[PDB]
Design a protein around this ligand. Structure first.
Ligand SMILES: *[C@H](O)[C@H](C[C@@H]1CCNC1=O)NC(=O)[C@H](CC(C)C)NC(=O)OCc1ccccc1Cl
Ligand SMILES: *[C@H](O)[C@H](C[C@@H]1CCNC1=O)NC(=O)[C@H](CC(C)C)NC(=O)OCc1ccccc1Cl
Lengths: 303, 303
C-alpha cells in the first residue's frame, strides 16, 4: 500500500546519454545504435538565437564541428542531418547499451519519466504529465536540453520527449524524438506563451480511486449523477469533459472499489463546490490530475 | 527553473538487484561483490511469521535452501550468515556491475531514493524522507521487501534503507544495510504502531526558499522574529525546534535570496496561523517538509 508519484527506473536510458558540443554550446544527446539525437539549437550562436535559419546554419557545419563524448570516450561523427527540430549525428560506433526502443508521441494527459541530464551525465529522475496546453511542469536548468522523457513497457523504452526550452511562466516545452514540437512553440530565444490550460478530469478521478484503494474515504457520498450533468460542472471549474471512453478506461478501478464512475463524479462535484475543509487526499490538499488510470493501476492492484 | 521531487538515477542500483527465494517465499536481494543482502524473514514460513526464532531458523537452513536469480542466470550460494535483520548470502560470482558504495545510516529528516522492486526486477523510483518517527511514506506491495533506498554522491552509492514491512497506518519500516531497524520495529507479523510524528521545520524553510527562488513570493512579509520566539510557535503546531545549526545549514539559501532565516521564519509563523487562503506554494496547498536544504540547493543554484 501507499501511493507515490513514481518514475520508471532510468538505467536503460542512462546508458544512452552523451554530451554534444558545438562551438561553445554544450547540451545532452541520446545515443541509440550509431546515431546521436540532440536539439538542433546546439548549432546556434549568441547572435543567431533570436531567429536563426537552421538550414543555413547546418549547411555551414562539418562533421568535425561536433564534439560528442560518451563519458570519457570521444565519439567520432561520420555524418549529420536535420529532422525537424532535432539534429541527427551519425557516429562510428553503435551504442552497445542500446535498449529495445520506440519513438512515440504522447497525448495531453499522459505521463512519462524525465531523466534530467547535464553535460551528458544523468542528474535526477521525475514524472511529468503532458498538459492539455502541451507544456510540462519540469525542473530544468541551463545545460539540460537534450534530456529525454520516456515510458518503459516490457523492457522496451518508448521515448516521447526531448527538452528544448523554458517559457516565461516557468513551464517547459520540447519535441518528440522526430523533432516535432509539442504545442505551438518554436526553438528560438523569443518570449512564448502557452495557451490556457485545463484540468485532466479522468486523471483526477483515477487519483480519487487510488485514494479509496489506500483508505481515504471521507469525500465519498451516497449520491450518483449523470454524465451530462457532471460535464456542466466540469466546464464551470475548467475541467475537461468526461467521455464514455473515459468511463470505460476507469472500469477496472470502478470494479476493484465497487464505486461506479458516476458515483465518484458526484464526489468530485462536491469537492469542487465545497473544497476539502482542511482535509487531505493521499497527502495533498488539492485535486491532483497528473496520474493516469494506468499509473494508478500500476500501484493499486495488490491493495 | 521549476522544482520537482526528484529521485537519483537508479541505474547503478538496478545492476545490483536480484531475486532471492527460500521455500515458497520470494523477495529481492542486493548483490554487491560476491554477497547478496536480503531481509532475513525470507526464511520464515506461514507459521513462524508471528514470532520466529531466526537463529534457530537459520541453523536449520543449508546453502541449497536459497534460490538466487540474477535475471535468468542462477547464482550459486556458497555461504550464509545473519547480520541483525539482514541475511548475507555469499555467492560464487562477484557482481561485475558493483558500484563504488558505502553503507550509511541516515538521520530523521534526511531523504533518499527508493528503487521499488518485485521478483528481482526494478519497477519504479521515488524519493522518501525518514520521518522523525522512523517510518517512511512509501509505495510497497507484496513482494517488495529487499527493495533498497540510497543516495548518490560522485558515482558512490550510499545505501541507507532495506524494506521489511508495512504498518497499520499504511506507512513503511525497514533497516539500514547492517540490518538494524530504523525505529522501534521488529520483523514479524505483529500490529506495530509508530510513535507520534512531527514536522521537519528546517525542511519546510528550505522549501519556502525553493519557492522564492522559483518566483512564489506571496507569503513573504517585512517582519523578522527571533529564534526563541519562533520555537514557541513551532511547539504549538507540532514542528521541530529550530537550532542555530539549522540556520547555518540554510545560510546558502538565505544568501542566494537575500532573505534572512529569521525573516523567513516570520513568514512560516503567519502561514501556520493563517493558512494559505486558497493560494499554493510550488504547486502544493500544504507546507511540504520532505525536501532537505541539500535537495533544494541541487535544483535551485542556476535559477
Ligand atoms: C537548453 O538547455 C535550454 C533549457 C532552458 C535553460 C533554463 N531552463 C530551461 O529549460 N534551452 C534554452 O535555453 C532555449 C534556447 C533556445 C531554444 C535557442 N531558450 C530558452 O529556454 O529561453 C528561456 C531561458 C534561456 C536561458 C536561461 C533561462 C531561460 Cl528561462
Ligand atoms: C515484504 O515483502 C513485505 C512488504 C509489505 C507487504 C505489503 N506492503 C509492504 O510493505 N513485508 C511483510 O509482509 C512483513 C513480513 C513480516 C516482517 C514477517 N509483514 C507486514 O508488513 O505485515 C503487514 C502486511 C503483510 C502482508 C500484506 C500487507 C500488509 Cl500491510
Amino acid at each position: 500500500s501507499g501511493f507515490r508519484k513514481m518514475a520508471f527506473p532510468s538505467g536503460k536510458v542512462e546508458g544512452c546519454m552523451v554530451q554534444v558540443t558545438c562551438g561553445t554550446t554544450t547540451l545532452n544527446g541520446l545515443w541509440l545504435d550509431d546515431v546521436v539525437y540532440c536539439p538542433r539549437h546546439v548549432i546556434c550562436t549568441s547572435e543567431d538565437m533570436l531567429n536563426p535559419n537552421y538550414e543555413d546554419l547546418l549547411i555551414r557545419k562539418s562533421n568535425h564541428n561536433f564534439l560528442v563524448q560518451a563519458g570519457n570516450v570521444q565519439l567520432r561523427v561520420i555524418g549529420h542531418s536535420m529532422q525537424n527540430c532535432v539534429l541527427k549525428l551519425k557516429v562510428d560506433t553503435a551504442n552497445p547499451k542500446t535498449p529495445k526502443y520506440k519513438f512515440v508521441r504522447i497525448q495531453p494527459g499522459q505521463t512519462f519519466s524525465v531523466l534530467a541530464c547535464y553535460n551528458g551525465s544523468p542528474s535526477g529522475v521525475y514524472q511529468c504529465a503532458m498538459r492539455p496546453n502541451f507544456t510540462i511542469k519540469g525542473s530544468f536548468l541551463n545545460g539540460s536540453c537534450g534530456s529525454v522523457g520516456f515510458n518503459i513497457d516490457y523492457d522496451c523504452v518508448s521515448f516521447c520527449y526531448m527538452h528544448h526550452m523554458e517559457l516565461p511562466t516557468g513551464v517547459h516545452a520540447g519535441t518528440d524524438l522526430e523533432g516535432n514540437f509539442y504545442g505551438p512553440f518554436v526553438d528560438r530565444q523569443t518570449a512564448q506563451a502557452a495557451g490556457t490550460d485545463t484540468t485532466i478530469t479522468v486523471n483526477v478521478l483515477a487519483w480519487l480511486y487510488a485514494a479509496v484503494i489506500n483508505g481515504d474515504r471521507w469525500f465519498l457520498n451516497r449520491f450518483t449523477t449523470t454524465l451530462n450533468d457532471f460535464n456542466l460542472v466540469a466546464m464551470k471549474y475548467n475541467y475537461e469533459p468526461l467521455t464514455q471512453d473515459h468511463v470505460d478506461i476507469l472500469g477496472p478501478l470502478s470494479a476493484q472499489t465497487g464505486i461506479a464512475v458516476l458515483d465518484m463524479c458526484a464526489s468530485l462535484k462536491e469537492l469542487l463546490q465545497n473544497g476539502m475543509n482542511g482535509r487531505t487526499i493521499l497527502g495533498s490538499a488539492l485535486l491532483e490530475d497528473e496520474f493516469t488510470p494506468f499509473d494508478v493501476v500500476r500501484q493499486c492492484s495488490g491493495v
